Homo-oligomer: A and B are copies of this chain.
Amino acid sequence: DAEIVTALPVPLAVAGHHQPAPFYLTADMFGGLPVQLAGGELSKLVGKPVAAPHVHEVDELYFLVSPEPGQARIEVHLDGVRHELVSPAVMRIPAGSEHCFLTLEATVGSYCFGILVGD
């Protein structure tokens, strides 16, 4: 009687996002989780932002990863300051901070996940 979720991703609306974002962990899964996790593979998102600047009332971690280090690069706008992240990298976005990211470079298998931390 294992607990398996394969109806994935779960599209959920997120502030400023053009489309609902694809979630793989949501707060209600498995009786409740302290995180939510959304994101996807970046290879076709180069130069195409998924959202306008937005703010959350919870902390958000960007997790950027690729099979080989350096194969993925995103630009994070944080309250009007630009930060370039190179895979692998984890960046904390404090709750209340205005932000978004733009994909600069991505191979097949590059991902950016946003991890919302429940407080």
Please report A residues at the B interface, Cβ cutoff 8 Å: 2-6, 8-9, 24-25, 29-30, 33-35, 37, 41, 43, 59, 61, 63, 65-67, 76, 78, 81, 83, 85-86, 88-92, 107-111, 115, 117-118
Contact = CB atoms under 8 A, between A and B. Distances in A.
Copies in the complex: 2
Contact of A117 (B33, B59, B65): B33
Contact of A29 (B3, B5, B86, B90): B90
Contacts of A8: 88-90
Q: Is the interface of A mostly helix, strand, loop or mixed?
A: strand
A111 to B, nearest CB: 7
12 contacts: A2-B83, A2-B92, A4-B89, A6-B85, A8-B89, A8-B90, A9-B88, A25-B63, A30-B61, A30-B92, A65-B111, A67-B109
